[PDB]
């Protein structure tokens, strides 16, 4: 048992043995971006791939080519926190080596000149930090992966809804990665139509003729020949017997003079068998059975040569006679059996108006670019670039793969462009599906939906930028003479950077990181949106794609998805899901050989999983991978059923594997209805981190992986011993075996102290280790926000009681004791940042001094001499944070104000007040002030002081680096210096620098000393250069937005306490708005007088079937019972052995339990530390569907001397008489969601109004009023309330003059209204008149 595990072991119920541990939860983001920017010594997807795609760029035969060599991501100028502070993207420059070869003109291919450009800069690309987040403008963003319809070809039905006659209209659709679409379809008349991307509909054969297939060749492609002979009498016919399946005979079909089939009967298998026996080849056929047929090829009148009948012509007795007499012994026809072989292509060719190749090109042209006259060459070029140009059409690697897979081809890698055979095979497959020998595909099948992560999407945008650079480059290459120009004048960095920065800043998929948990972040990064470019829309689609498909199992959580209008379109990734080489989701499975369940895990995609028969993870096995049963439950081909013990092929790798991380964190999930669990996951990812997170008593064992994999904690990178722990840093003296040879050193971790989230919450790390403790690799050193001891801790353990209490928990509402707010258990910290900007006006610059007119020294109390606020100031609403005045002129005040200024000598000042003041209602502490100034502007005192603070801090930080680093280094120096002789006096006494030139015994001693000598000189230069550069960073100016002088940002810290109105929620979708802070002596209380902390309404449990919260409540009661027993044993200071016995008994008490507590902990120290960590309650773990059964909960309760029924007897704190029917008390994990009430309560009387319409609006903490939309107007009309309605839409909103008359009347004590006319109506009039329409009031 690791040391950090010895700290507090979570009793793990759950019996199935874990065989595959949870992967790195952010591997999706990190791996995708790794693919993007990484030196790839071949064309595998990546930056290199885009380059190799577009380059080399060769002129328009100008014998001047621009070719690409290699690239190199420069170092980022700023650090991550540096960017977050200065508000700049955290990016790296993209240096690229190019070569411009000017060939030798006037002779065969030959290079005369080649300028190899010194790495043309061509933009910056935003790097991804160590958690899959980009810093784009100081704000962390996240690029959601996209789930989009894979390239390839798909065959759909379009069933039922056509021609009110059933008649499913089978259609096919080629979808490329980049390039135009290509659809084929059937009409009710069975006419195969084509349509390029979405245009008019054309008869399919057009494109066939386009590919230079003459009608003869077409029929030879889509049909089998039927031969007819005229063997000296009456139109014989060659015949193969299977061609005759399912027909009605028209003549005696007799060979060898012996009748086999009778004219007019249904063929039997024995009929065909007769035929196979006789080997019947040629049968004499009457001339009328050749009436309805259709000639295949073209037959001419060879007696004269001229034509006879066109190919694809239905023969007639006349034509029979003509072909006979002209000498055609052999006659071809199309085999068109309306059962198998529909005559579809024939009928189309008939509808096909064109005949030749060129006319076909012309028709395509007229459909594509209607209106312009069709040039021959233009038609050709359009059609070639349409589907077969490298430049304008790319299926993909994956496109080609899925394509060949759909056409049952064997090869996987092909070409990126289509080809003739491809289109033909698509048409054949479609025709087959129409014949019945094939099935359409379901679009929802996760074997057709691919995953584009960040790496791929950014690569696509970068490819876009590259192609526009190529445009401009070829343009320049063709124009001038090229000796003088070098390969960095051609190439602009504005367009590439434009494309990329656009994708990263303003895109549907780049979103502000949802940052109020570790869980919220880690679930934002595993999001799978179906929206975004090339995806669906929240209103286009669509009742169908939203539903969970049997293919989601193990790949996409079925319960974690938003509840609004994009239900089913967000789909958090599942826990063990991965991404195929092509981007198809695949999940692990244990390979089941004959009967023994092995442990090699194969990752299966959707289609692979479709074949085999996979067993559930809850199938009992016996120490030998043997299914203990005879028939076991499995899922086979989209369905579940029992199967022979010797039938399965794979087994689910674990029982958590179908849910996401969010859902796998709900204990007793399998007891909650799916709706309530959906709400529970969605709200659990909204908890705001409290003042001091604790742990969940009832967890699911997955808290640790989430808390660690999200980078909110400081995790040890090398084992060692904590040499110095501090509220702001942790210094680890690494172990020897983990050290590198040189650079012995130590490991420093600087914690993130109180800082802003994106949701204005305080992210802030506390060290959980203590001095001299030993730590191992991958161990948790500093608990981030909302984690405790490395376990995710979103909420608090509340003593809850289920009972109705005077209606205060009437609906979902909650009733909270006062002890909960006294202890500040749900008190959260919120940090706002308010920025005052000093812009340059046209009337003169603005000033930040404290010279602000007519605000008493009560107002300028807390401003320092320079006009900024003092750090540490407790401020409140309205107080001046940053005093700022702006120049102002042209008073032109009314006569009465002039008389005022006269009688009182009040000089009407010229500087208007525009200072930055605290918004109302928020009352916090100023905890930070930053000041940026445009360089050139002279700094004020306060900016210089902050600069001095920063400069001191940076000097001291670099000093601490080199100081304590050489402290460890000097420890090792004297360690190696006892070697080469243990020189005590003359070696220690010498100044620690008197070793650069001294000489020791020629072993690693002198070796290390000279190593540290290089270290010494080069690190001296390091310290000088680096302190210089950091001092330059500090003292330099900042690139402010053009026009501004200086920005001052002030950070307020607010300690929001809970209060009636805030929303709270357990983990099972039991929401609730707290409604009364009850005094302690009122809360119910048991025989020991402990009051309950929260009184939940029982009525919420039956209807909403989340019966999981009851189980969690009982198990929590049990856990806290163990904790109370151990706390009691610990207050008597009983002994170690008593505690050891009891704790051990607690850690057993189950059957087939997988907790596997070592039972060999440090006899006294570790056990006592444990018990100290358990006196608050023994943390339980309940894996999702491998839960803890009731009976185990009852046993845990008996172990703690608590009623196994889980219900105790209570007394009413108000009267002290007992409630009958014992109630359910327990401990529930309650989160406080960030729908805080003091961020909801707005109200206005009058404020600012809109500009064009004169209606209310605000953002300035006096928002607009509430919207009084249509439905409210209908409500007021449904009452007879005409006057209310009138004043609502005339004086309260729009009447620019009536509203002020109303105000003046209100203050005058006279409540009356003058209606006038709403300004919005005048606006509507003017906008009608501004059409050609004369609208006017009449009288």
């Amino acid at each position: 048992y690791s040391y950090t595990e010895k700290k507090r072991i979570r009793k793990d119920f759950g019996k199935r043995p874990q065989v595959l541990d949870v992967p790195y939860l952010l591997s999706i983001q990190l791996d995708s971006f790794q693919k993007f920017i990484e030196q790839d010594p071949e064309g595998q997807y990546g930056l290199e791939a885009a380059f190799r795609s577009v380059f080399p760029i060769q002129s328009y035969s100008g014998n001047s080519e621009l070719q690409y060599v290699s690239y190199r991501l420069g170092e980022p100028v700023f650090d991550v926190q540096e960017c977050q502070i200065r508000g700049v993207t955290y990016s790296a420059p993209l240096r690229v080596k190019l070569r411009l070869v000017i060939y030798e003109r006037e002779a065969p291919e030959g290079t005369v000149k080649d300028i190899k450009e010194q790495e043309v800069y061509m933009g910056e690309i935003p790097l991804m930090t160590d958690n899959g987040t980009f810093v784009i403008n100081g704000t962390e963003r996240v690029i959601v992966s996209q789930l989009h319809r894979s390239p390839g070809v798909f065959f759909d039905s379009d069933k039922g809804k056509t021609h009110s006659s059933g008649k499913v209209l089978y259609n096919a659709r080629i979808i490329p990665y980049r390039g135009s679409w290509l659809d084929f379809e059937f009409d009710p008349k069975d006419n195969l139509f084509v349509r390029i991307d979405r245009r008019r509909k054309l008869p399919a054969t057009i494109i066939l003729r386009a590919l230079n297939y003459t009608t003869e060749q077409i029929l030879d492609l889509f049909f089998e020949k039927v031969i007819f002979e005229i063997r000296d009498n009456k139109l014989q016919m060659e015949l193969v017997p299977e061609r005759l399946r399912g027909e009605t005979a028209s003549f005696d079909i007799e060979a060898n003079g012996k009748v086999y089939v009778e004219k007019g009967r249904r063929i039997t298998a024995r009929h065909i068998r007769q035929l196979e026996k006789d080997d019947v080849k040629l049968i004499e056929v009457p001339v009328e059975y050749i009436a309805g047929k259709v000639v295949a090829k073209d037959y001419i009148d060879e007696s004269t040569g001229e034509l006879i009948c066109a190919a694809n012509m239905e023969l007639s007795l006349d034509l029979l006679a003509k072909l006979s007499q002209s000498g055609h012994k052999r006659i071809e026809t199309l085999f068109t059996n309306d059962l198998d072989h529909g005559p579809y292509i024939s009928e189309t060719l008939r509808v096909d108006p064109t005949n030749d190749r060129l006319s076909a090109l012309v028709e395509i042209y007229r459909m594509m670019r209607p209106g312009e006259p069709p040039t021959r060459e233009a038609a050709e070029s359009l059609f070639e670039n349409l589907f077969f140009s490298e430049d304008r059409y790319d299926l993909s690697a994956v496109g080609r793969m899925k394509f060949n897979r759909s056409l049952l081809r064997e090869e996987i890698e092909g070409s990126g462009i289509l080809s003739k055979d491809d289109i033909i095979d698509v048409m054949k497959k479609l025709i087959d599906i129409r014949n019945g020998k094939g099935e359409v595909d379901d679009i929802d099948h996760l074997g057709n939906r691919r995953i584009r992560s960040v790496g791929e999407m950014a690569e696509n945008q970068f490819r876009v930028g590259l192609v526009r650079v190529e445009r401009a480059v070829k343009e320049r290459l063709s124009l001038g003479d090229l000796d003088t120009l070098m390969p960095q004048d051609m190439i602009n960095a504005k367009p590439i950077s434009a494309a990329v920065k656009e994708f990263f800043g303003s895109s549907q998929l780049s979103q502000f990181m949802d940052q109020n948990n570790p869980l919220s972040e880690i679930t934002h990064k595993r999001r799978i949106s179906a929206l975004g470019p090339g995806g669906l829309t929240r209103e286009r689609a669509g009742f169908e794609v939203r539903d969970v498909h049997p293919t989601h199992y193990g790949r996409v959580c079925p319960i974690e998805t938003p509840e609004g209008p994009n239900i089913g379109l967000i789909n958090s990734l599942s826990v063990y899901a991965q991404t195929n080489e092509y981007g198809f989701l695949e999940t692990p499975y244990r390979k089941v050989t004959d009967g023994v369940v092995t442990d090699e895990i194969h990752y299966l995609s959707a289609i692979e999983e479709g074949n085999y028969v996979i067993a559930q993870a809850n199938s009992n096995l016996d120490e030998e991978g043997h299914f203990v049963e005879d028939l076991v439950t499995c899922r086979s081909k989209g369905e579940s059923s029992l199967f022979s013990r010797d039938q399965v092929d794979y087994m689910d790798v674990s029982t958590q594997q179908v849910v996401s991380v969010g859902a796998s964190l709900i204990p007793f999930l399998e007891h909650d209805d799916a709706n309530r669990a959906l709400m529970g996951a969605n709200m659990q990812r909204q908890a705001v981190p409290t003042l001091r997170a604790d742990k969940p008593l009832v967890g699911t064992g997955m808290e640790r992986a989430v808390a660690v994999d999200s980078g909110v904690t400081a995790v040890a990178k090398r084992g060692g011993v904590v040499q110095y722990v501090d509220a702001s840093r942790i210094v680890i003296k690494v172990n020897e075996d983990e050290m590198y040879p040189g650079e012995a050193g130590i490991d420093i971790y600087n914690l993130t102290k109180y800082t802003r989230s994106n949701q204005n919450t305080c992210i802030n790390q506390m060290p959980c280790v203590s001095l001299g403790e030993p730590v191992e690799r991958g161990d948790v050193l500093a608990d981030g926000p909302s984690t405790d001891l490395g376990e995710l801790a979103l909420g608090q353990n509340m003593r809850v009681a289920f009972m109705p209490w005077n209606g205060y928990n009437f609906e979902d509402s909650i009733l909270v004791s006062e002890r909960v707010v006294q202890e500040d258990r749900f008190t959260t910290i919120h940090i706002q940042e308010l920025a005052c900007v000093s812009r340059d006006t046209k009337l003169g610059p603005e000033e930040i001094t404290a010279d602000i007119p007519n605000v008493g020294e009560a107002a300028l109390s807390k401003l320092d001499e320079s006009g900024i606020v003092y750090i540490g100031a407790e401020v409140t609403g309205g107080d001046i944070l940053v005093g700022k005045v702006t120049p102002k002129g042209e008073t032109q005040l009314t006569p009465e104000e002039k008389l005022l200024r006269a009688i009182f000598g009040e000089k009407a000042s010229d500087v208007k007040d525009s200072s930055l003041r605290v918004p109302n209602g928020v009352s916090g502490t100023v905890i930070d002030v930053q000041v940026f100034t445009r360089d050139g502007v002279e700094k004020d005192k306060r900016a210089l002081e902050i600069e001095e603070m920063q400069l001191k801090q940076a000097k001291k930080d670099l000093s601490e680096e080199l100081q304590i680093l050489e402290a460890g280094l000097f420890s090792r120096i004297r360690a190696v210096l006892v070697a080469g002789g243990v020189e005590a006096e003359k070696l220690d006494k010498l100044p620690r620098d008197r070793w650069l030139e001294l000489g020791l015994t020629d072993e690693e001693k002198q070796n290390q000393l000279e190593q540290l000598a290089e270290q010494y000189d080069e690190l001296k230069h390091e310290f000088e250069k680096k302190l210089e550069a950091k001092r330059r960073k500090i003292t330099q100016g900042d690139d402010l937005a053009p026009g501004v002088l200086k920005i001052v940002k002030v950070y307020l810290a607010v300690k929001r306490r809970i209060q009636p109105g805030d929303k709270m929620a357990g983990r099972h979708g039991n929401k609730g708005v707290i409604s009364k802070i009850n005094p302690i002596e009122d809360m119910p209380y048991d025989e020991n007088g402990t009051p309950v902390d929260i009184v939940l309404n029982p009525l919420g449990v039956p209807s909403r079937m989340n019966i999981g919260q009851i189980l969690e409540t009982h198990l929590g009661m049990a856990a806290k019972g163990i904790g109370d027993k151990i706390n009691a044993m610990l207050k008597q200071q009983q002994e170690v052995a008593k505690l050891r016995e009891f704790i051990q008994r607690a850690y057993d008490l189950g059957a087939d339990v997988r907790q596997k507590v070592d039972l060999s902990t440090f006899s006294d120290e570790e056990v006592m530390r444990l018990a100290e960590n358990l006196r608050k309650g023994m943390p339980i773990a309940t894996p999702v569907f491998d839960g803890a059964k009731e009976a185990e909960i009852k046993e845990l309760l008996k172990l703690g001397d608590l009623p196994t029924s889980g219900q105790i007897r209570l007394y009413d704190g108000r009267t002290g008489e007992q409630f009958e029917r014992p109630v359910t008390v327990g401990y529930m994990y309650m989160l406080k969601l960030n729908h805080l009430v003091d961020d909801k309560m707005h109200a206005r009387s009058t404020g600012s109004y809109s500009l064009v319409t004169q209606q209310p609006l605000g953002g300035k903490a006096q928002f607009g009023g509430q919207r009084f939309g249509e439905m409210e107007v209908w409500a007021l009309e449904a009452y007879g309330a005409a006057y209310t309605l009138q004043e609502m839409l005339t004086v309260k909103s729009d009447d620019v003059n009536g509203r002020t008359k109303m105000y003046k009347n209100i203050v005058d004590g006279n409540h009356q209204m003058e209606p006038g006319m709403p300004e919005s109506f005048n606006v509507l009039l003017k906008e009608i008149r501004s059409l050609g329409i004369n609208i006017e009031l009449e009288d």
Partner: peptide, 13 residues
């Protein structure tokens, strides 16, 4: 004529 409304087309034609 292809009943086109794009004036660019009309001018170029």
């Amino acid at each position: 004529i292809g009943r086109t409304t794009d004036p660019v087309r009309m001018y170029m034609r």
